[model samples]
Target: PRGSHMLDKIVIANRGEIALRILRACKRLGIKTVAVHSSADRDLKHVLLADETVCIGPAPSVKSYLNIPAIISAAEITGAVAIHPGYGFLSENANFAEQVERSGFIFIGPKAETIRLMGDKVSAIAAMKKAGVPCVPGSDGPLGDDMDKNRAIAKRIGYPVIIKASGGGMRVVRGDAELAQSISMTRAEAKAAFSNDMVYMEKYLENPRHVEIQVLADGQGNAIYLAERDCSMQRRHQKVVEEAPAPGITPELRRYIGERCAKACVDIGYRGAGTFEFLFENGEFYFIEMNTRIQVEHPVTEMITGVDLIKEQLRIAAGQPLSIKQEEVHVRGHAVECRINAEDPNTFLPSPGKITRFHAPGGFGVRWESHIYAGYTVPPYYDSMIGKLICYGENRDVAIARMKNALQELIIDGIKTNVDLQIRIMNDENFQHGGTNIHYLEKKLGL
Candidate 1:
């Protein structure tokens, strides 16, 4: 027999749309929220919508939002029972979670130990593999000196295997004949150079797409994978556009990978919300790593799943069993999101300043998730993503149609934004075709 313990109030230790999302979840759950702000972030929308507020300090953004000790202290001062780090900053940090619980306040996330394990990519991949999850073929651990064993590992992973040591991009051997030479040359370095040296090999997946599984597991032993999100659209390291049901993914693909992810969660005692990121290529999925917190692209997943991820995080943190079971989870429709960043089209540089005008988009299935408003100033101190425009419909084409209307209707003056380019892609034939790769955007821009 499991149980439930509801949270009365919690501290929102983040900024921007994520914070606003957390506050909205709190309102729905009848939970009081305490919003913490930095010197430059008092005017953030979440702070205004919050039940109560605390301005951390009047100083730099780093000093303002990243003070763990100050945040923990702020929780007690406000009489909060827990703290929800909306998305970034200290949310996924092990130290912050440990400190919060050390002071007697519950942290609305996974265990400190789990956070630490998943934070390191090497250990996390091994852990997922043991849970029967698919992983990229690689040398299991630290590479040995035996050329035969090394070559064996390389050959097993096949040609174009990336030889990496503690994370390096120095070697990529395409054939067995080249493996021996490349290994010694790379492995030969740092000898008597005062080095702790080691390297491993993994299958190099060129032209891969990014597809991540959004999972939730209550510590009470119930876990479920909430379908999947294909965020293949990107610009270098940043993901600009995202959608659910990945257009190219089949029902068999989703259930196969989705089941394994859920099983992995149960095997590891995973709690709250976590994302299992994967690289999709040639119709096969390989583990990339895991994000131990809610992601910036979460709203798109939420639109398709009809699950309030933040609310579920609170319920799990309160020692309650999962509200929904695996059998009940459903992917109802199509959803797409455009990260409306404050930046120029070609330059992609930050356009942080006062937002003099913000005309919110309205219509069927259009959502504007932002902490910025007409009069509020966009602080240059943080991320360039000022808003997330999410649209939903019965299918992918309809979703794109909704997004185009939303982007066209919305207007944010007094700051440069990527709106024009976003609309441009919405009308692009290649994008409308779906199954675009991660390189599509960069290749389109000729970067």
Candidate 2:
């Protein structure tokens, strides 16, 4: 099973807000934390507050955050019993997970085999289908070199088939003829991008809402789904806002989807926290992909359910059953989260510099999770997101109002932020009425 005596020391192999989040969880559990950073992140708040710190390399993430050998060495030197690969960097890298276990430290997530199985799109879809999860109609496996056979499969799946490589190159073909014409070129690109010429097909859904289920599972075969998050408010496939208990979702529908996700986790032997992403159009949900790590929008679910996901992640890693059972899980309020990024509102260009002045919003229902503060310099080398501003209220309208107020009250000087843009979204008629699809933002902004 996944249990250990208590983890005395943990290393955070990430930077910024996520790293800070994990560090805070470890701190509250009385677990000492080791912060690993690049030269650029030496002064980050988490680094300053950690029990110990290690500078892995220079400012570039390649030499630091993405450097697997350096991170393991840091863990070894710090005597860290576990490594928490927060959200990004090598968090979902199956090879990294394997290496962590081989090095004699807990990876703090799923096993290396599970990661490898789910990381490959073709195999992941196959597994999900086997688990009785709804999936988009597609080829059973990687396309063959035979043009006639590929066209026949595409014809059966209908028009507008999406050709996807295991490593993430995508192209749309409208008919069997187009599928035949694009197969070779797509394969070549896939080989260049993923080092695998393998490709698969799926029927493309036109205007779908991006909804996902948040699941928590322990190694002892206990699994529960917290709820679903509406992540349709996005730009360029990057989620800018998220909310729990998606509007218009009935209790029965929620349970139906939630139970399916939990069952999928158990069927696949999933452990720890994970997300089952789905594409929802009309009333049907089609499984898209699974994120085998804690999400940035996890706080939204926590705000509604009163669960500390980060803390649970630690407990599961330490070999403990979930603190609460499925029957004990309940939602108390509505929650919304806005990803406040260091970027221009209209142009959406990154703005990195020193924050000469910074003031975060605060109220009875507001929670700001950030690493930025006055005099802090936002490095240019990483993600533009500097913080997450969340609001909770008894209902959706109240939560929206709280978020709007918080957005207006926030002030960050000497660096561009998307606060104004977020405020506009909160005030938008369609957004307020809800039921906006993934294409809403791009359509609204004409992007």
Candidate 3:
């Protein structure tokens, strides 16, 4: 079995709400937590809540959170048995994982080898396809130098195909001639940016919904998918709202995709908590990249499935089998999560200042996850997201109503936030109904 070892102490290699979330789980498991932070984050809630706190470096992340040597030294001196990188800073980095394990501490996530395999988008897609998981039609590898063969492949896959650099960027073409030009241009761009000229092609789907499946696996080859989350409500590729048991999906379709996702995890020998992202279009699902850490919107899935994903991650890291069986896994009601960002609602500019007033909504079925208090300062150096407002109800309509109430009750002064915009979305007709796609927000924002 993988990750079957127990940990007595863990160093949280992140700051903000996610770090706090992990701290709560560790506390429940009777594990001591050491919080690492930059000088700028000394007063952050996680630092105050941790059993131990360490200031690794200055404010900038490149010198603080991203400084692996400082983190290792802190962990070693503090006698931490494990390191839990909450979500972002180096969580998916294979090198960081290797270093943590080499330093005699368990990395509370997937194996470094697994992270390396799924980190490459091209290779991940091919592997998923080989595992009988649906994937967007595209090249198995980098486009060949032969223009004729490339053009033939593009035509077979259909026009309006997209050329994507291995790093990131999508270029769309509508014809063979245009595709050939796009290939070369993308190759040049990839070479310049990522130092690799490798580019792949895929038939692009217009206005597809963004959905994902949450899976938990143990090192002993046991895995099960909790369910799906609809993340189609996005703006500029950033998700604004997410919900569980995505509307318009039948039970049969849900089972089919859920089973496939679990099978893919088993095939890859994946352990720990991971998310499989997909693009849903015309009743078909296409594979996208996988996120190898806890997600920002994980609370919605937890509300519906009645599972504590953070706790599951700790257990999986300890080499324990899933606490629940596939048959026991079920989605009960509807749950919605809205990310509250410290940004201008109209211009979407970052707003960093003291939060003089902070009042989160309350009542039944409302869960507000945040680290900020009435007098805390919103830092400008990190992400703009400051909190998450989640609500649960007996049905989708009720969930929306509860969220609306929660939004109206939430109050944060001294800094701009998207509370007003979220209220407007809850009141929008298209959002109230089902079937919004990835392009819905962009179109709504007139982008």
Candidate 4:
């Protein structure tokens, strides 16, 4: 909790591949690790990998992974020197991190204030504005009583404007849609997604690409960029395929955006790893929001940059100065990652059950990040994301070719996985040529 010591023992407070990933990192660091899970997860690969494994409670997340008191107790009982909120659960929970530090354990992330600022959409926008990071043209603060005035602004910005709610809320309404539909649809989405009606609007460039910069910072001033990823091929705003050294980013733009994000992280006292997500269109960049925790897409950046982000997180959490200097970091070759989820390829519905047979793809330029084996049972209580299939190429074409081959080689049985569809999408002429936007997958799949 002192923010100035290397932890001797660490506890990973989550499940699945990420937990195993972090455990591997700790093992390499020669530090002991504890993996915590719910009753339904004692057999998970991560649980088996940890130096110590504990089941905090039952299967429902509320009683297990999300059970703050139970997790805290596990830490206390094990005397874990630090707790790594792998990604989900309480990874971005400002209060949880603070509480962990209060209970005499390092939280292994940014301070509470930074988390509170970046956790939500509106406040994240406000923080970017304060940091002088450019955002898409629109209202800086909350939209007010002047619906008429706002409508005029929306028209000026062009149709298909997206109205996103504050507080990390999601309510995307297209400007091209009828005004009534936009308002009603946005309101419903905002309320349902965030339980808050507070929303704001921005011009939604038709089929914009989802590009983001990976930012690293030491609370003590050193900051660096791990390059960018092209997340354009996505479904429902959730990315399916992501690649690094984003194609089309000129050298000047690459340095400008990546360094700008690093500077922002340093300015905000952001420690550990984070992402500056953006929407690109019409040959310009617009800041969206920052994810305060390590992202699923991070592996793509790692594959290209060759920097072990998990190890970096532990070092930064242990109060060590950032090891990678700006000059030392460079995006080498191209890398792409496909999120192999357990779901219906067409409907995108959860396909949770036992994985009767599982075979990971192998060959040059391929890495499989998963925790399940052939006999492992996939639990239905959490998100359906199984793992990431990452492939790197000396160039983009080879990357796509490798991904196509690797996806074909990969197989999971007893439950439907979108592997076939992934193979199909990888072969799409548009995707093969980097022709896509955030909505491309949804339209292609008719989802």
lDDT of 2 by residue, 18-136 (tens): 99989999888888889999999989999999999999999999989999999999999988889999997898999999999999999899988888888998789989999888889
* Tens-digit per-residue lDDT, 1-447, candidate 3: 222246888999998889988898888878888999998899999899899999999989999999898998889999888899888889999999999999988888999988888898767877788778898898767788899888988888877788889876468888876877789888888888878888888797987899999988886778899989999998887899998989999999999998998998999888899999999988889988789877878999999989899988888887778887789998899999999999999888799999999898999999999999899998889889999999999999999999999999999999999999999889989899978988888788868
Q: Give the best candidate by lDDT.
A: 2
Candidate 2 backbone overlaps, count: 1
Question: What lDDT score belongs to each candidate, Candidate 1 first?
Answer: 0.86, 0.89, 0.89, 0.83
Q: Which parts of model 2 have CA positions greater than 4 angstroms off?
A: 1-5, 139-201
Model 4 residue 379 CA deviation in Å: 1.3
- Tens-place lDDT per residue, model 4, 210-241, is 89988888899998988888898877767888
TM-score of each: 0.93, 0.88, 0.90, 0.88
Clashing pairs in 2: 3-319
**Tens-digit per-residue lDDT, 276-347, candidate 1:** 999998888999888888877888888888888887888788888999987888888899999988898888
Best model number under TM-score: 1
Cα RMSD, each candidate: 3.0, 4.3, 3.8, 4.3
For residue 330, give model 2's deviation from the true position in Å.
0.7
Q: What's the alpha carbon RMSD for model 3? A: 3.8
Model 1 TM: 0.93
